[PDB]
Amino acid sequence: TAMKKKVLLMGKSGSGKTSMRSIIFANYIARDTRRLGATIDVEHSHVRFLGNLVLNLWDCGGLDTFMENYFTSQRDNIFRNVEVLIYVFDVESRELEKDMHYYQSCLEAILQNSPDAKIFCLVHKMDLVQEDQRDLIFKEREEDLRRLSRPLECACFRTSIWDETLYKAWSSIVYQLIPNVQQLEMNLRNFAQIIEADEVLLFERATFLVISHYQCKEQRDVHRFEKISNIIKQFKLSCSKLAASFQSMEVRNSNFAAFIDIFTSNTYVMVVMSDPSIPSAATLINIRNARKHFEKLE
Amino acid sequence: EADLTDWNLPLAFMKKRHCEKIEGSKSLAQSWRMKDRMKTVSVALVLCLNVGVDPPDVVKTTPCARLECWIDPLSMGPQKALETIGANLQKQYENWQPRARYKQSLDPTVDEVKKLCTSLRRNAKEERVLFHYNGHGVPRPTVNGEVWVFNKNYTQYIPLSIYDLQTWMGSPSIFVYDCSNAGLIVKSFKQFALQREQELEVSMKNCIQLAACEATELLPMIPDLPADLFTSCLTTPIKIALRWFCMQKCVSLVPGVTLDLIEKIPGRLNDRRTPLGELNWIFTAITDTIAWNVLPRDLFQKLFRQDLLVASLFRNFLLAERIMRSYNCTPVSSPRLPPTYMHAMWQAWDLAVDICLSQLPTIIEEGTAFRHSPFFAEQLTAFQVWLTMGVENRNPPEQLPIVLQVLLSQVHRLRALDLLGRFLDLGPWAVSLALSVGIFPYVLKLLQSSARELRPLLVFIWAKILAVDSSCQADLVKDNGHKYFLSVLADPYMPAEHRTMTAFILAVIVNSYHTGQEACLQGNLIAICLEQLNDPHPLLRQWVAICLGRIWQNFDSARWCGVRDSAHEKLYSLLSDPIPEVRCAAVFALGTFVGNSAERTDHSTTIDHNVAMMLAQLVSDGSPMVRKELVVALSHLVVQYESNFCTVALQFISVYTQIWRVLLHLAADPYPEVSDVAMKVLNSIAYKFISATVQTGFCDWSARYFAQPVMKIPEEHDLESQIRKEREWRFLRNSRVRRQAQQVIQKGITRLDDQIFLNRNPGVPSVVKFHPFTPCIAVADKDSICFWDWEKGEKLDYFHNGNPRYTRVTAMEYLNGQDCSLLLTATDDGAIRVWKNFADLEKNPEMVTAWQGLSAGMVVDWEQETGLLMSSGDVRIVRIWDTDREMKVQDIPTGADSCVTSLSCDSHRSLIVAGLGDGSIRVYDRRMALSECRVMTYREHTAWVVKASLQKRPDGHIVSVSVNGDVRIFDPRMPESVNVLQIVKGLTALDIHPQADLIACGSVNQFTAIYNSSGELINNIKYAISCLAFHPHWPHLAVGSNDYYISVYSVE
Amino acid sequence: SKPRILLMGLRRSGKSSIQKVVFHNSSFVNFQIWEMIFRGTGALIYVIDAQDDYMEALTRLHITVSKAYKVNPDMNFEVFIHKVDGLSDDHKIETQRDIHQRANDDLADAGLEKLHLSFYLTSIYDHSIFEAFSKVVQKLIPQLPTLENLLNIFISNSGIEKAFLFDVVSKIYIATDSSPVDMQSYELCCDMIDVVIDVSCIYGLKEDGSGSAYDKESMAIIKLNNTTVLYLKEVTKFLALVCILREESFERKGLIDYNFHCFRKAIHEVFEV
């Protein structure tokens, strides 16, 4: 018995929608996406997230033929009861004008059926662009999109399969769909202050998407959340393949001490310390003792 | 009374998976399809009227029958009348076949007929042509096989040979003769047919013929009727059927019904809601019913189902047979029908007409609302009455074809589809009938409907169809009926019973058929299935997983979609499901998921290794059914990575290492079927491609659930059933044996030296048990299980346990002791196994189920009421195998180095007592956690604790005995002993009684000391006495010496 | 004072990216993609593409190997038969036997029979390239049966199943205990070093822009579901010790940590650190 949320994933043929879904929620690798075929019509994805939230993923095939069916015969089935619209653009695309027409046709249908829906726009495949031009091209596409989105508001992200940009995009949508998000954010910030941590990250177990966080000292790399999600997810898969299932981790330096361990049925937690001469058990005892208090909130 | 104890106990290992074999039901030769769709493409209306002049043969009466296609020819003048009759005749045929080339020949020549027929064969190349001949204006056809036409001037009747007529017309054709001696034409047609066959060496079955008359007979001249009587019947049945009704003696029954009211009947022949269309519809039901009941099935599907126009002609021919009969005319057909005129169903027609046109005075004149006929209602009522006591293959219900006609409207569609489901349920024999009568294309057409009320009924009907004939997966995908069911499987408000039928329907539509897999994939099946995978219905969870498994079976597109939706992850939940069907269905799908890799890179390979290791933790599984599919699933993994498993296989003569080690455990399975299938797959690696792929019959066996009946009361609930009476007789016999045994205990246990018998075994007696009620005393050895008796005094049976030469049968139990008893046989190495039909006359040994526990030897404690069984031995663990869930529930740590020599347990107040080899006697409570479990650890011995047994009372007493031979009665709530005794110096084996408190000791020095719990002497019977065994009720004591002998003592 | 290694080969063969992956300046090994150059080099690694024609490759191999022998006769020659390590056995075996055959055939023709050519089957996705590296680097360092034995004494006295002495940057293991080494294990330990270094680069790298991700206090404990414990500890600036053991043995951490100090002191003595 959980909150069911409808998520549309739309964009042109070849834009990289199934590649996103496969990497984030299907334990996929960047290299093995080039073999993904054209998704016929809508291919749904029931993702169980945190037990209180179920994501109804509608991966909509952007073949112009399928696109016209979504605007006509399937208008009510596709655009009704929508919580989030994730729209994907291929940055390397030639048909920029035609892309915007298909985007606007979706927004019209959204305005008419699910006007409440959160809109995210992903300027995807930024890896095909030279590094020094990536920022310029994105800000240029973003300003256009914010304008072209006319009455409705939209959030824009630069995405690439190989890097953590995927986590930048997905985190916001997933973060903004948590039923207890405010409560969750608060409870984790409470736990963090009590445990005396420099940073506490909370991840969904299966996907490794950051669902909540807390920071003390304003950190340098503002893209670390997605990097850590990418790193540990790759490791998780390597663990189950190469030996046995991942259970827990601890990392140290002269500057830090991090602990990754199972938290709830559907989550993982990471606690980072400004590596003081605190023994590993005193940190692990505090983790175990804090479980009993955050559990009450659910 | 001692009956409430019996009825309220779970019978372990007595369900479908155990009793029946795990095998698919063999589909019979389904011969219901129309293996041809012929069509009557064009029609030839040859009319030889010569309106005005009568031919020489028949001089007609002064009033006379004149009407020709409902036209008076003499009214209109000669020439116009002939065109008009031709026009009307065309219209009449166009009611039945509106899309065919009609081509009239009006008072034709011979050349005129030649050019007409030869042209129609050219056009309708290999499809059927109708030739209608109306010879009312020409002389009667001759014996010499001739039919008359005219010369161009209309001055001479020219004969036309039937031979030449069947030359010009082709092979697939149908002939309608409406003339006087019309039988002669049919005789001579068949003669010339045989004559052509003789000439062909150095068009019989193809050619249908209807004829108005027998060769002798003349057509009736009665002024009330048409001249065109036969043609009229075939082509306008309702018109003559009503006119004929008004000419009979039975009109007396309906006053105010003249011929004039019939002319002015309201309605049309299409609109079933009008009065005329009502009758037309009823008539179509009645004729089609008579035909189905009267004709052999072959000839019915030939005539009444092949093509529309033929079927219409023969339906209407049955009316001609009835009507013309009443005028000394017998119509004649080429594919001869048996006589239908006398079918009871005509009495139904009479009543139907009567009631319908008793209303005509009020409908025409008063303007009264036309009440619909109760015909269809009453016929469904008859069909319903048949179903009540119609469980058998007796005479089928006459009304099947009426049930078909009812589906066509909406008025009675709900009720019919209900009854049709109820019928199809009866068995697969019934589904065969329903498909032969031709229900298929109408049931398939209803899947285009939106009326939500139909959804539960059609889902039921289609599950029953597809359970029998799986070929219909072709038809359902073509018409987009696969979408209809997808909607039902994604509907929370639709009941879970009907959603299960829907999941089965999709699993059949999808089964090994790319068109259906590609279609359901696009209709978003994988997403729909995962939403219903965690339902509170074990059948739905099962089928949804099979359905998920079938869709990605040899279909890489459905696998990729499963990876995106992350199905394999959602399916891991089913691997720890209570129900062993569901666990198996889950194992099936995860295996089918693995098998269709087509050699991908990291994404696919990393997933297969995750699915491998998740399956590899269902080795230690209770159900052998799950373990078979677990092998078959890992077979698909071996076939895919054959190069890697050859590396692992050749080494021992770390992923792949683990999966090969799994197959070694499945190779050394207690159960035979699993060991065999594991051995095949393991040997196909050894000698090194796709040939190795085994398929279990699980999904086919599962599918048998929908062939069998559902709606009706089961056999067990029936109070008057023979199974229940013999079960109640066994329970009455049980309560007596408890009472009679209790009476012997109350007298005070006297001396005990009576020997009931002394027999000798092939092997050394290792372990002995007494069957609670029936005198069956199983005395197993190293391998075998001899079943002796102590009333007759005879050898009843001899098994082989199946275990190797190293192994030994340590422990034994009697599962379901009260009724339909089984025999658990725990081997020392770990193997547990269960035997049915162990001391029967007409039956052999039968191993029900068998599963590796663990890994002293092995100890077991059955708990009939709880349903549990707790293996222990050399290991430092006490497993608790639930036999309802066929899984190891709890693994309690012993906290002891030495072997668990004995194990006894308690229901109600859960207390696992476990003696040990070092000397100690632990007690565990299974409610609390594993760290806490140790309730007590008292040590007052030092040896192999032979038996630490617990009593059935709330005042529990742990009677523990060592090799040194000294009893110490403990309590569960105390840290030290209550009573103390010292019995024998060198003890070898011991047994303790449940009801009374006897203790039957053994000795190295051949003694058999039988003392009380208090420590009093009763006997010291002078002869390694390695097995003693008390009854659960009676004070009888078995013994078995080191020498190959048995005894059974008694207190009188 | 680091062991010197040279990568050579033809245009678009396996030099640039090989070096990139091996360097992930803070490594026990001096590594560099390529007559003064062959003067202070201990081992030369020629990379050959096995999924393509190797005829031109074998020609350039003989030229570079003969030239380097003239300069330094004591130098080791290693051949990485690349793009086909953990593949099949029909192709790979044929390719192996042929390259081995032809290379030694060409060597005999120039009278270079005093010249040894070591061959290795390497891969890209797979972490078997580092197995190649392993072999090479073992030869480079003079104290062969000295780290192997020190690890055997440490893991026997403690409750450790497997121990690897890794170069942190490249993730090449310079020694291991005498027990057979499962590939996947090596793989898993390499996968740990990745998460170690990557989490270290993000968090705790001074308040300013950069410091050091790997230092004297770098250490890690990873627990798996099967009770397996992976234990990383710093040995030198470039060398780390990764141990595989069980949770039962890890309960005796005090002894492991005390024995480790003996081990660490000994590794410093060996390399004169």
Ligand SMILES: Nc1nc2c(ncn2[C@@H]2O[C@H](COP(=O)(O)OP(=O)(O)OP(=O)(O)O)[C@@H](O)[C@H]2O)c(=O)[nH]1
């Ligand atoms: N360079 C690059 N390639 C990408 C990226 N994302 C996806 N691709 C590749 O581009 C292709 C995208 O295919 P899909 O993900 O199946 O595309 P889709 O948008 O679902 O397409 P339809 O089902 O036809 O609507 C595959 O080869 C991916 O591997 C990305 O961020 N960068």
Ligand SMILES: Nc1nc2c(ncn2[C@@H]2O[C@H](COP(=O)(O)OP(=O)(O)O)[C@@H](O)[C@H]2O)c(=O)[nH]1
């Ligand atoms: N499949 C595979 N591709 C490789 C491997 N090594 C290099 N490549 C590819 O070969 C191409 C040439 O590699 P590159 O390193 O640029 O060659 P270089 O000129 O020697 O640096 C690139 O597309 C690499 O992805 C390998 O081991 N396996």
